[PDB]
A paper describes a structure:
Adenosine undergoes ATP-dependent phosphorylation catalyzed by adenosine kinase (ADK). In plants, ADK also phosphorylates cytokinin ribosides, transport forms of the hormone. We discovered that maize and moss enzymes can form dimers upon increasing protein concentration, setting them apart from the monomeric human and protozoal ADKs. Structural and kinetic analyses revealed a catalytically inactive unique dimer.
The asymmetric unit contains one monomer for the ZmADK3–AP5A complex and two monomers for the PpADK1–Ado–ADP complex, all in the closed conformation. Structural comparison between ZmADK2 (open state) and the closed state of both ZmADK3 and PpADK1 reveals that AP5A (or Ado) binding induced a rigid-body motion of the smaller domain towards the large domain, resulting in the closed conformation. Two helices, α1 and α2, shift by up to 12 Å to shield the Ado site from the solvent. The electron density map of the bisubstrate analog AP5A in ZmADK3 is very well defined. The ligand binds in the groove between the large and small domains. The purine ring of Ado stacks on the phenyl ring of Phe169 (in ZmADK3 numbering; PpADK1 numbering is shifted lower by three amino acids) and establishes hydrophobic interactions with Leu17, Ala66, Cys123, Leu134, and Ala136. The N1 and N3 atoms of the purine ring are H-bonded to the side chain of Asn15 and the main chain nitrogen atom of Ala66, respectively. Both O2' and O3' atoms of the ribose moiety bind to the side chain of Asp19. The γ-phosphate in AP5A forms a hydrogen bond with the OG1 atom of Thr294 and the side chain of Arg132. AP5A in ZmADK3 and AMP-PCP in ZmADK2 adopt the same conformation and position in the ATP-binding site. To form the closed ternary complex and bring the two subunits close together, the enzyme must be monomeric as shown by the structures of both ZmADK3 bound to AP5A and PpADK1 bound to ADP and Ado.
Residue numbers in the entry: 4 to 344
């Protein structure tokens, strides 16, 4: 088939350890609700504390893995997706390999000899979660691994390449190597803003990669964080989307299209100097089960139609379908086959 390995993702493969907790649990580990952070030494016993709970759920996660997973599911073409990351030689790493084969992703996972597979605590309070990412083996990815002929073949075969902003903490040099290849080969390189701490702490790494980005995705909060960091005196998402697209580009082959989600409010898309708003699928609060992986599934649905050379209206329509499905189910899960027509 023509779509063989047409979409590649590179990131942090993390097994999510999710559980419903109370206010005291977050106060114990000093974690703010509805915010993502990287794990510190004080947060490490929390993983064993969550593992001991009766309501603990284990699901193969990681922002880029989730988006590639949802794109392959929406697309339904066998062998169309590829993924690159680092895992440990342990039970969680074998679960990561098992899940990727079931999902239909050609995941070339580099197995580190000493580090365990990365985990991510998803502490849930009401309808807001705190993510504490312990990258462990995921943080061991080197440009040396990407340059291996087995891994670099996936970069060359791909036409569309996606990397969540989270991977900028692990290897900005590996990101830059595939980004420079995509500019030189007129391919579609794309990224996510991922979290406010990526825009604030990793501002230099993100700024260096952005000129190579053809489709930048994000939510309203991380777009406002991005605007405040660059001194733009504006909170309006519509003005911020045009200002991001307006930034310099390493290659003028493609324009930069900025897609910003606003939860239940319309999707804002800056494209060729014009702002296009798209209302989302109306959903009652009783059916809204969990907003976990809503942003990652939105990117996945968008990528499924972008791969088939479809217009931006159909990319956003599939992005809303995929996110709508995921929010009505626990975590980033979906039915056997998609019903997008
Ligand atoms: N360091 C690290 N490295 C790698 N991975 C890491 C990591 N740290 C964490 N991760 C991974 O991250 C994952 C958890 O991420 P998670 O916290 O779930 O992020 P997300 O998937 O982006 O979900 P959010 O709740 O943040 O949504 P959003 O604000 O982006 O989107 P919006 O609400 O605008 O909504 C988007 C769309 O949803 C739909 N939608 C949302 N709300 C509604 C509504 N009320 N009604 C209708 N449609 C809605 C719409 O279509 C809308 O456009 C885990 O797998 C974990 O492993
Ligand atoms: Cl990632
Ligand atoms: Cl319990």
């Amino acid at each position: 088939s023509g779509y063989e390995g047409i979409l590649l993702g590179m990131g942090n493969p993390l097994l999510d350890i999710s559980a419903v907790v109370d206010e005291g649990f977050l106060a114990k580990y000093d974690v703010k609700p509805g915010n993502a952070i990287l794990a510190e030494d004080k947060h490490l016993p929390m993983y064993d504390e969550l593992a001991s709970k009766s309501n603990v759920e284990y699901i193969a996660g990681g922002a880029t893995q989730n988006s590639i997973r949802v794109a392959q599911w929406m697309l339904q073409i066998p062998g169309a997706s590829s993924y690159i990351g680092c895992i440990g030689k342990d039970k969680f790493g074998e679960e990561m390999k098992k899940n990727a084969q079931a999902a239909g992703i050609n995941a070339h996972y580099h197995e580190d000899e000493n580090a365990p597979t990365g985990t991510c605590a998803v502490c849930v309070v009401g309808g807001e979660r705190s993510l504490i990412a312990n990258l462990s083996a995921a943080n061991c990815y080197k440009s040396e691994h990407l340059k291996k002929p087995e891994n670099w073949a996936l970069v060359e075969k791909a036409k569309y390449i996606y990397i969540a902003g989270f991977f900028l903490t692990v290897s900005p040099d590996s990101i830059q190597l595939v980004a420079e290849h995509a500019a030189a080969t007129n391919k579609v390189f794309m990224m996510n803003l991922s979290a406010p701490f990526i825009c604030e702490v990793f501002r230099d790494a993100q700024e260096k990669a952005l000129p190579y980005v053809d489709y930048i995705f994000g939510n309203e909060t991380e777009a406002r964080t991005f605007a405040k960091v660059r001194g733009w005196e504006t909170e309006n998402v519509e003005e911020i989307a045009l200002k991001i697209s307006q930034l310099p580009k390493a290659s003028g082959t493609h324009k930069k299209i900025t897609v910003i989600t606003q939860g239940c409010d319309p999707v804002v898309v800056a494209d060729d100097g014009k702002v296009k708003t798209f209302p989302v699928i109306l959903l009652p609060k009783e059916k809204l089960v969990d907003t976990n992986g809503a942003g990652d599934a939105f990117v996945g649905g968008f990528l499924s139609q972008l791969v088939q050379e479809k217009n931006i209206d159909e990319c956003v329509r599939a992005a809303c379908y995929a996110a709508n499905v995921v929010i009505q189910r626990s975590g980033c899960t979906y039915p056997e086959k998609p019903d997008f027509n």
